[PDB]
Amino acid sequence: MRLDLDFLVAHVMLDNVSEEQYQQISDYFVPLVNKPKLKSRDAIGQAFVMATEVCPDANPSDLWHHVLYRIYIREKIGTDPSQSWVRTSGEAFEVALVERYNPVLARHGIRLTALFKGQKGLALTRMGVADRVGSRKVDVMIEKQGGGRSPDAEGFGVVGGIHAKVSLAERVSDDIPASRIMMGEGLLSVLSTLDVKSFPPPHGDLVNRGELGTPDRPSDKRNYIEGHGDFSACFSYNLRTSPSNATTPSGRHIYVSGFSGQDDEFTDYLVAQL
Numbered sequence: 001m002r003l004d005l006d007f008l009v010a011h012v013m014l015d016n017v018s019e020e021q022y023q024q025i026s027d028y029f030v031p032l033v034n035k036p037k038l039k040s041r042d043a044i045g046q047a048f049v050m051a052t053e054v055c056p057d058a059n060p061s062d063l064w065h066h067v068l069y070r071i072y073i074r075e076k077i078g079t080d081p082s083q084s085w086v087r088t089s090g091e092a093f094e095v096a097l098v099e100r101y102n103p104v105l106a107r108h109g110i111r112l113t114a115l116f117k118g119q120k121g122l123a124l125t126r127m128g129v130a131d132r133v134g135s136r137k138v139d140v141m142i143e144k145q146g147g148g149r150s151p152d153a154e155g156f157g158v159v160g161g162i163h164a165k166v167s168l169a170e171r172v173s174d175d176i177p178a179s180r181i182m183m184g185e186g187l188l189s190v191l192s193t194l195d196v197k198s199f200p201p202p203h204g205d206l207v208n209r210g211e212l213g214t215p216d217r218p219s220d221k222r223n224y225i226e227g228h229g230d231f232s233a234c235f236s237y238n239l240r241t242s243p244s245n246a247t248t249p250s251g252r253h254i255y256v257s258g259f260s261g262q263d264d265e266f267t268d269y270l271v272a273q274l
Contacts, residue, residue, distance in 0.1 A: 003066060005206070011199075012066060013208045016058040025051045031084060033075045040088035041116070044068060046096030046118040052100075055274075060259035061194045061238035064166070065208050092142050093164045097192060100259065104267050109145025110274055111156055126150035127158045130175050131184060133178040139164040142188060144274050160188025160232070166250055167196040167209045168221050176230045183232060188273055191231040192266075195238035212254060214242040225252045232273075235266050 001019050003012045014022075028050055032043035040206035051063045061263055072085050081087060100113050115123050123132035123141045128149060140162035148157015161182060163175045179189040195210035213219035215226070225234045229250030237259045244253035255265045 001179070003070075003083060005070065007201055009208060010201045010206060014058070014062060016057050017067075018062070021055050022067065024054055025063075026071060029068060029071055030075050033072060034077045038083055040072075040083055040085075041091035041095050044072065044085075044089060044092035045099065048092065048259075049099050052258070056258065056260040059208070059239040061196055061210070061236075061240070062208050064194050065198060066206075071165075080256075090139070090164065093166050093192075093194065096259075097140055097162070099166060101248040101267060102209065104263055105270065108271050108274070110270055111143040111145075113141045115139055115141055118165055123158075127161065129178070129181055129187070132181050137175065137178040138162070138182075140192070142270070142274075143191075146208065147274070160190065160192045162192050163231070165191065165193045170192055172221060172224070176224065180230050189232045190259045190269075191225070191234040193234065193236050193238075195236040195241045208238060209272050210236065210238045210241050212236065215245050222254065225254055226250055235269075 001014050001017050001022055003014055005012065011026070029043070029047040032038060032047065035043065048064060049070055051067065052060050055063065069085060076085070091114065098112045098114045104156050105112065111122070117136065120138060121130060124133065124135065124138060127141070138161040142160040142162060143156040144159045146155055148159045151157040162177065165172060172241070186220060189261040195212060196208060197211045198204060198206045198208045200206060212222045215222070224230045226244055226248040227250055229252040231252065233252060235254045236253040236254060239256065239258065241254065241256045243256040257264050
């Protein structure tokens, strides 16, 4: 369906999203935006999971960037920076990943756990890397029934971590030292991303292409994965993201898939490695 964006007016084609489906997503999300005692990360997080269920053939990144985002900044009451999309969207992505994958991962004993700003010291210490990375480095922790280090009472040990970045245009090179230190300790360092990147009018056409280019085109971002192997693996939910070729110099790959469903390349990856 066609979206009308006011900057000057511009349009963007939202493939595999019907007028009916947009409204169903909007009827779900809007009342949650200004709901008291309901954190923005939970409102946006659950909405993303719901939206991908409603439109399983639509580009998940487009649902994030062109639907949820533009509805939020339109419906959000107040300029409170602690409730900003910018301040909360990242943690909403973490919430979305946990909600989406843990039911599938539960069977194999694999457990995800979102880490929010200020409360990841326990996670990082148990991970044994807080020593060298600081208190603001890992977004989602990966634990495993049985194996791992610093197991809780239920026998869940830390086996790795996830850097959840909505856009790779972010300070992505900032997470690379921590990721290297993680991988060196025998921990999985996954880069989960929505690969959000569109350019606004007057010069951009607002198509969410991302920042990973193509394997035929030298991209510094892509070269982190396929060149230097600074992350264990890279998972994008922007359907426009060019996946890695069969072989890469580092042996690391950029996997691309939709967000809806049961098992995918992400769960199948975590199962094998763990």
